[PDB]
Chains A and B, each alone.
Chain A
């Protein structure tokens, strides 16, 4: 029972590695894409001005 309990624990832990790494990569990419989109918006606004 103890072995299977902390086996479920380590399985959840491995899922946690995968989820945390994916979330970190996704947020970094989202920040970079937001910076690029803001750059495009600002240079278009500058051209309009």
Chain B
């Protein structure tokens, strides 16, 4: 029961806090993702245009 109490009042709050932090980090990296995609579109258009003329 002491191990269970660690799981639900020590490991459980730790894992919930890790869950919120990792979900905020997932949001962080999908914003890194779409900003890197937007730079991708920038370089792709710049390359295609400059090669075009």
Contact = CB atoms under 8 A, between A and B. Distances in A.
A23 B49 CA distance: 24
A26 to B, nearest CB: 22
Given A4-B45, A4-B46, A8-B52, 14 more contacts: A1-B38, A1-B41, A1-B42, A1-B45, A4-B42, A4-B49, A5-B45, A7-B49, A8-B45, A8-B49, A11-B49, A11-B52, A11-B53, A15-B53
Interface of B: 38, 41-42, 45-46, 49, 52-53
Chain A interface bracket (under 10, 10 to 19, 20 to 34, 35 or more): under 10
For the residues of A in contact with B, the DSSP-based class is: helix
17 contacts: A1-B38, A1-B41, A1-B42, A1-B45, A4-B42, A4-B45, A4-B46, A4-B49, A5-B45, A7-B49, A8-B45, A8-B49, A8-B52, A11-B49, A11-B52, A11-B53, A15-B53
Contacts of A11: 49, 52-53
